[PDB]
Amino acid sequence: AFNDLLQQVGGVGRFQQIQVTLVVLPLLLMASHNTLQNFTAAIPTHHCRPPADANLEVWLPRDRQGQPESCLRFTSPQWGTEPCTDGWIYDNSTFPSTIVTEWDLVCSHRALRQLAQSLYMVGVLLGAMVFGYLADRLGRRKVLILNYLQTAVSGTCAAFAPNFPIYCAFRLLSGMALAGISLNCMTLNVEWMPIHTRACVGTLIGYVYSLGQFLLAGVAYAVPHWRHLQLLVSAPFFAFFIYSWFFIESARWHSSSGRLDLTLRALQRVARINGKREEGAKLSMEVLRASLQKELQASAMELLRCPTLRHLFLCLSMLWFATSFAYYGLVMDLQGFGVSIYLIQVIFGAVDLPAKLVGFLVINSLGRRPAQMAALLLAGICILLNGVIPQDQSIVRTSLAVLGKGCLAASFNCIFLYTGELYPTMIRQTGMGMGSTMARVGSIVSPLVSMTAELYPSMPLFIYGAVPVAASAVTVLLPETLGQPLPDTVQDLESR
Ligand SMILES: CCCN(CCC)S(=O)(=O)c1ccc(C(=O)O)cc1
């Protein structure tokens, strides 16, 4: 019954305004880190370095396009092919330095650029799990303080990485910390705020991430060099670590632990901050106990064990994997469209704003399932048509990728509501975590799929498209939730 107490000590008041602003400010740089490698790893045009002894036309084989071939140089001077031992010359017009230029992650080692994104995301999957356990054991706040320090240290050390294995290690650790920031952000804010506003928070947090995409575009234009851009995007988290010491730990986590002494201390401190001091003094242990006694979940396995909840698990896992796998596939590949990588990031960021509305409108009106078939099928049709339409077309390809990314942003928003209303109260938090875990598996698998570009230039896109088209067909199986009350038991779910 914490909700009741939550409204005695000011409800939303100075403490919630101050702390929530501060706890959601870091998220503005989650987008900057997740998709940083579009700018820190951009691939400049590379052609082989002519042999040093020789004093480009004569030393470079030309492809059909008539541009110098990237991975080959002539063995002997041809007037009017060996792999390149002497290195590559990279165009410096757009990208002064990138991890690709620094470590020659080009030609045979091209897959390494994507391995690094996959490793960062392996870190994000690991961090959601490690830090989720650690938060329940050490506190939402203590785990946040340590996560701000880890992102700052790991990201700074990645910027000063001397070799590629080390950059990848510090990028996995950066992601582990960031996964814990994104989780503990929600928990600390949601638990210190009213229950009814469990979605507005899910929204401000959602839009604060989208604004992060414009932040990456503006920051990357200003600081093109990768070591400098990685340092700039990670140095803010040392400042976050310094003020995070003044956060107030969730009183709800304190009550759950068994320490009502700290629930009382937090509630009184907040009453001083919100200005309702008299009302806080009234709060004692005879009151807090009785009014928090009723409050005082099922194992994840159950999702698999019950046939009813296994069907809802499998179906939703395909929906969460597909949306993430496709979304990262599209968001990762900003260079191919033929427009500046900065304008495309700004555009891609913008779409999320009219998308989320159009989504809200179709979801609250038509249904929660028709919106998921439409958001995923249309994204799949757009991505597969980006694959088929010839590159020459930049506007037709850019417009279709932009619509597709907007549709996958809508799918993210719907799959959150859809997944919280489909599950019964007992397994609803486990189920939203498993769904988010499958989303993170999608992000790990997506860069690995992109490595198939070598096999065929359009194979990466044909998969990033076919998977959402298949997920859309899976939504047919799931049950409509519009106008139906949330289920409380498996039987309840079965009934409706
Ligand atoms: C909670 C898991 C989802 N994630 C992907 C897995 C790492 S995420 O990076 O947090 C993300 C991505 C995209 C959008 C959006 O466009 O709405 C919001 C959040």
UniProtKB/Swiss-Prot annotation:
| Chemical reaction(s) catalysed | (6R)-L-erythro-5,6,7,8-tetrahydrobiopterin(out) + a dicarboxylate(in) = (6R)-L-erythro-5,6,7,8-tetrahydrobiopterin(in) + a dicarboxylate(out); L-erythro-7,8-dihydrobiopterin(out) + a dicarboxylate(in) = L-erythro-7,8-dihydrobiopterin(in) + a dicarboxylate(out); L-sepiapterin(out) + a dicarboxylate(in) = L-sepiapterin(in) + a dicarboxylate(out); prostaglandin F2alpha(out) + a dicarboxylate(in) = prostaglandin F2alpha(in) + a dicarboxylate(out)
Coiled-coil stretches noted in the UniProt entry, renumbered to this chain: none
Identify this protein by name. Answer: Solute carrier family 22 member 6
- Listed SUPFAM superfamilies: MFS general substrate transporter (SSF103473)
Q: Where is this site: Important for interaction with cidofovir and PAH?
A: 412
Organism from which the protein derives: Homo sapiens
Q: Describe the family membership recorded for this protein in Swiss-Prot or TrEMBL.
A: Belongs to the major facilitator (TC 2.A.1) superfamily. Organic cation transporter (TC 2.A.1.19) family.
Another remark in the UniProt entry says: Involved in the renal transport of a variety of drugs with well-known nephrotoxic potential, therefore may play a role in the etiology of the drug-associated nephrotoxicity. Uptakes the diagnostic agent PAH/para-aminohippurate and clinically used drugs. Mediates the pH- and chloride-dependent bidirectional transport of PAH/para-aminohippurate in exchange for 2-oxoglutarate or glutarate as counteranions. Can also mediate PAH/cGMP exchange.
Result after altering residue 272 to W = Increase in substrate affinity
List the GO terms this entry assigns under cellular component, sorted alphabetically: basal plasma membrane; basolateral plasma membrane; caveola; extracellular exosome; plasma membrane; protein-containing complex
List the Extracellular topological domains: 30-114, 167-169, 225-227, 333-342, 391-399, 450-458
Q: Which residues cross the membrane?
A: 9-29, 115-135, 144-166, 170-192, 204-224, 228-248, 312-332, 343-363, 370-390, 400-420, 430-449, 459-479
Keyword set includes Kinase: no
Q: Which UniProt keywords apply?
A: Cell membrane, Glycoprotein, Membrane, Transmembrane, Transmembrane helix
Q: What is known of its domains?
A: Multiple cysteine residues are necessary for proper targeting to the plasma membrane.
UniProt xrefs under Pfam families: Sugar_tr
Instruction: Give the molecular function GO annotations.
Output: alpha-ketoglutarate transmembrane transporter activity; antiporter activity; chloride ion binding; identical protein binding; organic anion transmembrane transporter activity; prostaglandin transmembrane transporter activity; sodium-independent organic anion transmembrane transporter activity; solute:inorganic anion antiporter activity
- Cellular localization per UniProt: Basolateral cell membrane; Basal cell membrane
Q: How does it sit in the membrane?
A: Multi-pass membrane protein
| Side of membrane Cytoplasmic, spans | 1-8, 136-143, 193-203, 249-311, 364-369, 421-429
Outcome of swapping residue 49 to H = Lower Vmax; increase in substrate affinity and increase in the affinity for the nucleoside phosphonate analogs cidofovir, adefovir and tenofovir
